[PDB]
Motif scaffolding. Structure first.
Motif, PDB file in Angstrom:
ATOM      1  N   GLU A  99       0.777  -1.383  -0.151  1.00  0.00           N
ATOM      2  CA  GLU A  99      -0.020   0.154  -0.158  1.00  0.00           C
ATOM      3  C   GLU A  99       0.759   1.309  -0.146  1.00  0.00           C
ATOM      4  O   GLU A  99       0.396   2.337  -0.395  1.00  0.00           O
ATOM      5  CB  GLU A  99      -0.996   0.190   1.189  1.00  0.00           C
ATOM      6  CG  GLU A  99      -1.689  -1.302   1.376  1.00  0.00           C
ATOM      7  CD  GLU A  99      -2.554  -1.187   2.700  1.00  0.00           C
ATOM      8  OE1 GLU A  99      -2.728  -0.073   3.177  1.00  0.00           O
ATOM      9  OE2 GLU A  99      -3.261  -2.202   3.154  1.00  0.00           O
ATOM     10  N   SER A 100       1.938   1.189   0.620  1.00  0.00           N
ATOM     11  CA  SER A 100       3.059   2.296   0.646  1.00  0.00           C
ATOM     12  C   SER A 100       3.551   2.292  -0.612  1.00  0.00           C
ATOM     13  O   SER A 100       4.691   3.069  -0.893  1.00  0.00           O
ATOM     14  CB  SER A 100       3.925   2.233   1.740  1.00  0.00           C
ATOM     15  OG  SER A 100       4.829   0.866   1.713  1.00  0.00           O
ATOM     16  N   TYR A 101       3.199   1.783  -1.816  1.00  0.00           N
ATOM     17  CA  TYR A 101       3.704   1.839  -3.201  1.00  0.00           C
ATOM     18  C   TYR A 101       5.286   1.296  -3.115  1.00  0.00           C
ATOM     19  O   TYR A 101       6.244   1.842  -3.796  1.00  0.00           O
ATOM     20  CB  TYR A 101       3.917   3.292  -3.776  1.00  0.00           C
ATOM     21  CG  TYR A 101       2.587   3.734  -3.823  1.00  0.00           C
ATOM     22  CD1 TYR A 101       1.835   3.699  -5.185  1.00  0.00           C
ATOM     23  CD2 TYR A 101       1.862   4.427  -3.182  1.00  0.00           C
ATOM     24  CE1 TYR A 101       0.644   4.212  -5.462  1.00  0.00           C
ATOM     25  CE2 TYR A 101       0.497   5.125  -3.389  1.00  0.00           C
ATOM     26  CZ  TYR A 101      -0.055   4.781  -4.666  1.00  0.00           C
ATOM     27  OH  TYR A 101      -1.280   5.081  -4.835  1.00  0.00           O
TER      28      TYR A 101
ATOM     29  N   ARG C   2       7.089  -0.110  11.871  1.00  0.00           N
ATOM     30  CA  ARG C   2       6.972  -0.073  10.265  1.00  0.00           C
ATOM     31  C   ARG C   2       6.309  -1.316   9.752  1.00  0.00           C
ATOM     32  O   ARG C   2       6.231  -2.354  10.260  1.00  0.00           O
ATOM     33  CB  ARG C   2       8.243   0.041   9.406  1.00  0.00           C
ATOM     34  CG  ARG C   2       9.180   1.435   9.798  1.00  0.00           C
ATOM     35  CD  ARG C   2      10.502   1.262   9.333  1.00  0.00           C
ATOM     36  NE  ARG C   2      11.192   2.602   9.311  1.00  0.00           N
ATOM     37  CZ  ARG C   2      12.606   2.880   9.032  1.00  0.00           C
ATOM     38  NH1 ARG C   2      13.379   1.858   8.988  1.00  0.00           N
ATOM     39  NH2 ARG C   2      13.241   4.042   9.339  1.00  0.00           N
ATOM     40  N   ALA C   3       5.658  -1.071   8.704  1.00  0.00           N
ATOM     41  CA  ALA C   3       4.651  -2.353   8.162  1.00  0.00           C
ATOM     42  C   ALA C   3       5.671  -3.010   6.965  1.00  0.00           C
ATOM     43  O   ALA C   3       5.163  -4.276   6.412  1.00  0.00           O
ATOM     44  CB  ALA C   3       3.677  -1.786   7.185  1.00  0.00           C
ATOM     45  N   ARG C   6       7.811  -7.475   7.960  1.00  0.00           N
ATOM     46  CA  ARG C   6       7.817  -8.882   7.210  1.00  0.00           C
ATOM     47  C   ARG C   6       9.003  -9.173   6.077  1.00  0.00           C
ATOM     48  O   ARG C   6       9.579 -10.089   5.849  1.00  0.00           O
ATOM     49  CB  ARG C   6       6.404  -9.193   6.850  1.00  0.00           C
ATOM     50  CG  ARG C   6       5.311  -9.001   7.893  1.00  0.00           C
ATOM     51  CD  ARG C   6       5.172 -10.019   8.584  1.00  0.00           C
ATOM     52  NE  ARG C   6       3.970  -9.793   9.493  1.00  0.00           N
ATOM     53  CZ  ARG C   6       3.557 -10.702  10.306  1.00  0.00           C
ATOM     54  NH1 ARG C   6       3.936 -11.554  10.618  1.00  0.00           N
ATOM     55  NH2 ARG C   6       2.251 -10.132  10.925  1.00  0.00           N
ATOM     56  N   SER C   7       9.008  -7.966   5.297  1.00  0.00           N
ATOM     57  CA  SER C   7      10.208  -8.035   4.068  1.00  0.00           C
ATOM     58  C   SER C   7      11.628  -8.320   5.071  1.00  0.00           C
ATOM     59  O   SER C   7      12.292  -8.878   4.609  1.00  0.00           O
ATOM     60  CB  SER C   7      10.227  -6.549   3.642  1.00  0.00           C
ATOM     61  OG  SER C   7      10.797  -5.626   4.398  1.00  0.00           O
ATOM     62  N   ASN C   8      11.669  -7.632   6.217  1.00  0.00           N
ATOM     63  CA  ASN C   8      12.764  -7.658   6.890  1.00  0.00           C
ATOM     64  C   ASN C   8      13.063  -9.274   7.436  1.00  0.00           C
ATOM     65  O   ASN C   8      14.155  -9.727   7.090  1.00  0.00           O
ATOM     66  CB  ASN C   8      13.093  -6.840   8.167  1.00  0.00           C
ATOM     67  CG  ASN C   8      12.820  -5.310   7.810  1.00  0.00           C
ATOM     68  OD1 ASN C   8      11.955  -4.683   8.237  1.00  0.00           O
ATOM     69  ND2 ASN C   8      13.880  -4.815   7.028  1.00  0.00           N
ATOM     70  N   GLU C   9      12.189  -9.882   7.954  1.00  0.00           N
ATOM     71  CA  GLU C   9      12.349 -11.345   8.358  1.00  0.00           C
ATOM     72  C   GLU C   9      12.795 -12.084   7.025  1.00  0.00           C
ATOM     73  O   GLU C   9      13.662 -12.995   6.943  1.00  0.00           O
ATOM     74  CB  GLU C   9      11.159 -12.010   9.089  1.00  0.00           C
ATOM     75  CG  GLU C   9      10.976 -11.493  10.435  1.00  0.00           C
ATOM     76  CD  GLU C   9      10.079 -10.190  10.592  1.00  0.00           C
ATOM     77  OE1 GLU C   9       9.533  -9.728   9.566  1.00  0.00           O
ATOM     78  OE2 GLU C   9       9.988  -9.714  11.743  1.00  0.00           O
ATOM     79  N   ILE C  10      11.851 -12.167   5.921  1.00  0.00           N
ATOM     80  CA  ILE C  10      12.139 -12.973   4.903  1.00  0.00           C
ATOM     81  C   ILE C  10      13.473 -12.675   4.070  1.00  0.00           C
ATOM     82  O   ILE C  10      14.116 -13.631   3.539  1.00  0.00           O
ATOM     83  CB  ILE C  10      10.926 -13.014   3.859  1.00  0.00           C
ATOM     84  CG1 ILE C  10       9.576 -13.661   4.383  1.00  0.00           C
ATOM     85  CG2 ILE C  10      11.393 -13.724   2.636  1.00  0.00           C
ATOM     86  CD1 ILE C  10       8.763 -12.486   5.026  1.00  0.00           C
ATOM     87  N   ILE C  11      14.046 -11.292   4.160  1.00  0.00           N
ATOM     88  CA  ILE C  11      15.168 -10.964   3.705  1.00  0.00           C
ATOM     89  C   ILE C  11      16.060 -11.445   4.422  1.00  0.00           C
ATOM     90  O   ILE C  11      17.174 -12.108   3.820  1.00  0.00           O
ATOM     91  CB  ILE C  11      15.200  -9.270   3.586  1.00  0.00           C
ATOM     92  CG1 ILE C  11      14.555  -8.821   2.317  1.00  0.00           C
ATOM     93  CG2 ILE C  11      16.819  -8.975   3.613  1.00  0.00           C
ATOM     94  CD1 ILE C  11      14.394  -7.171   2.488  1.00  0.00           C
TER      95      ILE C  11
END
Lengths: 142, 34, 62, 121, 141, 17, 34, 17
Positions: A99-101, C2-3, C6-11
């Motif tokens: 959603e934050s592009y 920050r949302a 999840r990107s951080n854990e999979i990275i």
């Protein structure tokens, strides 16, 4: 120099990068807007077909037209017409973009997403339009 | 005592071309009548 | 907060060679890898402190 | 590449939009209160264009740091004259590679090729 | 005649050192900061290898690169050799007092061999024997 | 004057009686 | 009428070199191909 | 100096493990 839109160049030259974004926006947009308005008004007078004009008007139109060209986002504009030629969301529905592009690495690396959806017609679509190279194309014909 | 700011010009296209010849041997006559 | 967590854990669950090739092909990643930023901060601090102290030392020996 | 932060681009774009709306509405004689056709497909392009540039800037800064460190290492005299010189360089290179840091292997090839030329004067 | 740093050098030249140390420190450091920022900014835009550059760019880089050189404290930076070969609050040091002064009692009574200015002098297998450039030059030729 | 600075030493050797 | 001050020059390293030769006898051709 | 820009792509193709 007393001209309202000419003093902007002077203040740009003197003050410079210490200014914030809005002031630079105004001082740089005034001239562009004036030039665009003049160009439209001057083009709107003549005819369309270039076989019906005098040589002075031909050269004048050729020189003056270039101010209105667009080069980057043509594909987004032309996407609409090809739809009807061939036939006859809210970001969240897209895959690979949050959603934050920003890119969603979790889905990319887990769900094995083949393509990232920039525009429409990324979903399905048999129209193709595959990128090519101008130089190889030119060598083909010769 | 000053901070000049440069700008980015818009690219323009007029089709690429090789360098012209010196003598430029062209048609001998002028005009469409022949 | 920050949302993008999840990107951080999979990275984080990647072999270093995998991250290297992912950067090399340019497809994904670079602003979200939690090591490059640390590299910049640490090396910047070292450079600044060492430059200043060397300048003062040579000036004293002058 | 003219801006350095996202907020500056946001404000610049907003102001240019506000000016252009009236500047174009004036010509036709149309009242401005009466332009939002493909907003998503333009936001996506703008944001991608910004993110790529930011990534390039960060990796270049990392390369500058590595260049400074190499130059600092290369100027010590007795370490080079000492019979234990190459092993330190190889250990440093391996440590740098195995912690992200140096982004790809092309950069490693480039630095290896340049160090030989440096160690001549 | 209005730049903040273009008047600082003039006022330092005229007034001299009649003021305290801090003012001279700032007046000298302004231009140094400006120079470093300019050089770093130019260097960033460049390439790394010298085989991919033009002539003018190579000359510019080789001329302006040298201002980052440092000569005095290289060894302290580079000591971090321990990792390549293997695989402290002043009080624990010998020959140095708490006030960073020499301790004559130990060096005159206990017959201390050497003074550990830095680390790695405790134990030690890295050698690093001092040399002279001219002897090496004669040796090679 | 000041022909060239003197590099800082790792450790220094002394003697005694 | 004042107290002038000097600045300590930055040390520079460029490797020693002997004096250049006036005649400068070198290769007679320029160019890789031969 | 500056060079010519690049038009925005319609879609991107990526790879995986």
């Amino acid at each position: 120099m007393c001209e309202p839109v000419s003093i902007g160049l002077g203040i740009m030259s003197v003050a410079g990068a210490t200014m914030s974004a809005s002031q630079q926006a105004k001082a740089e947009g005034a001239a562009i807007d004036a030039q665009n308005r003049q160009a439209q008004e001057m083009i709107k007078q003549m005819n369309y077909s270039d076989a019906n004009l005098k040589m002075q008007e031909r050269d004048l139109k050729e020189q003056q037209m270039a101010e209105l060209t667009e080069t980057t986002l043509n594909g987004i504009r032309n996407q609409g017409m090809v739809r009807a030629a061939v036939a006859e969301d809210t970001v969240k529905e897209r895959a690979g973009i949050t959603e934050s592009y920003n890119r969603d690495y979790a889905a990319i690396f887990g769900n094995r997403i083949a393509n990232i959806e920039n525009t429409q017609s990324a979903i399905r679509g048999q129209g193709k339009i595959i990128k090519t190279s101008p130089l190889a194309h030119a060598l083909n014909v010769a | 005592c000053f901070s000049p700011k440069i700008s980015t010009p818009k690219p323009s296209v007029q089709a690429p071309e090789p360098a012209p010849l010196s003598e430029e041997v062209a048609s001998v006559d002028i005009g469409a009548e022949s | 907060t920050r949302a993008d967590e999840r990107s951080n854990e999979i990275i984080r669950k990647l072999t270093p060679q995998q991250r290297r090739e992912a950067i090399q092909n340019g497809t994904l990643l670079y602003q979200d890898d939690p090591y490059a930023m640390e590299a910049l901060r640490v090396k910047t601090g070292r450079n600044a402190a060492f430059a200043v102290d060397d300048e003062i030392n040579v000036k004293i020996q002058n | 590449g003219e801006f350095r932060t996202r907020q500056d681009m946001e404000e610049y774009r907003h102001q240019r939009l506000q000016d252009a709306a009236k500047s174009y509405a004036e010509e036709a004689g149309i009242n401005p209160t009466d332009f939002n056709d493909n907003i998503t497909d333009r936001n996506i392009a703008i944001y991608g264009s910004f993110n790529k540039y930011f990534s390039k800037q960060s990796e270049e800064t990392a390369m500058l740091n590595t260049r400074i460190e190499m130059n600092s290492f290369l100027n010590d005299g007795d370490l080079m004259r000492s019979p234990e010189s190459g092993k330190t360089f190889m250990a440093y290179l391996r440590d740098g590679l195995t912690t992200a840091a140096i982004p790809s292997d092309q950069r490693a090839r480039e630095v290896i090729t340049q160090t030989v030329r440096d160690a001549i004067q």
